[PDB]
Write a protein that binds this ligand. Structure first.
Ligand SMILES: O=C(O)c1cccc(COc2ccccc2)c1
Length: 258
């Protein structure tokens, strides 16, 4: 239920934004934005992809990094071989914002994942408007019919949904929804505990045609390699990069791991 406190805050913040930027305007801005990059193709490149994350804080970690210049951080990440950059845009717990997403989009060539708690269609068009190529959808946040439509609406905008699951039952739900990319978060969003055995419990269960991303728990090459050994096509890494004095070297170590 950390999820739910995060979610009530999100719904209020979206409504307040929408009051200043109507759903019609954001729809128009999304429609008008340059088309999204082909994230599936990027995910299918040789090697384990490193999805490098821009994140200032979290409920679990507290303050991680000031990231005065998220564009510059994302530049380091691309220089280091990152496949995708994840930008957290939730303001109250993670101290992110859309501005970060704008800054990252303008500064890198690799695809950009908007990492936030997608509860409403507004945020989907908003993601597209602000340049996201990939959008996080959290199965534990979303009732199935809503999941299905959020997924459908994401893909109708050209974006790839990174459908995040924590359990085999969530996985099954994701698959039934039409997920092409499934992320397994070692972290339980209700309680914030990081169970590392998750990916390897779940990943074997998935069709081979589905792309598998290991979210969380990556401290270095050994964790990357372990997820790699359990079927990961890519890993998402944030805490160890944002707190680095040399994020490009930290990324480059992971990109070349093995
Ligand atoms: O580290 C934590 O305390 C934490 C709590 C809830 C979610 C996540 C990770 O997933 C997301 C999803 C959207 C935006 C940011 C993090 C991490």
């Amino acid at each position: 239920t950390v999820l739910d406190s995060i979610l009530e805050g999100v719904r209020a913040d979206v409504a307040a934004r929408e009051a200043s930027v109507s759903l019609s305007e954001i729809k128009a801005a999304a429609a008008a934005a340059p088309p999204p990059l082909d994230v599936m193709a990027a995910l299918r490149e040789p090697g384990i992809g490193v999805i490098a994350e821009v994140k200032r804080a979290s409920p679990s970690a507290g303050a991680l990094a000031t990231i005065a210049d998220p564009a510059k951080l994302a530049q380091a990440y691309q220089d280091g071989g990152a496949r995708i950059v994840s930008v957290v845009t939730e303001q109250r717990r993670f101290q992110g914002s859309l501005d970060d997403l704008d800054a990252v989009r303008a500064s890198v060539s690799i695809p950009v994942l908007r990492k936030d708690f997608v509860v409403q269609p507004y945020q989907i068009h908003e993601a597209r408007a602000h340049g996201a190529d990939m959008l996080l959808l959290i199965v534990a946040a979303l009732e199935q019919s809503v999941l299905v439509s959020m997924l459908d609406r994401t893909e109708s905008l050209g974006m790839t949904a990174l459908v995040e699951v924590h359990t085999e039952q969530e996985a099954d739900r994701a698959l039934k929804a039409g997920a092409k990319v499934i992320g397994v978060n070692a972290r339980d969003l209700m309680t914030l505990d990081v169970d590392r055995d998750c990916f390897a419990r779940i990943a074997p269960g998935l069709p081979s045609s589905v792309i598998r991303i290991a979210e969380s728990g990556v401290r270095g090459t050994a964790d990357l390699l372990a997820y790699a050994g359990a079927g990961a096509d890519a890993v998402l890494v944030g805490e160890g990069l944002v707190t680095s004095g040399d994020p490009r070297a930290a990324v480059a170590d992971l990109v070349t791991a093995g």
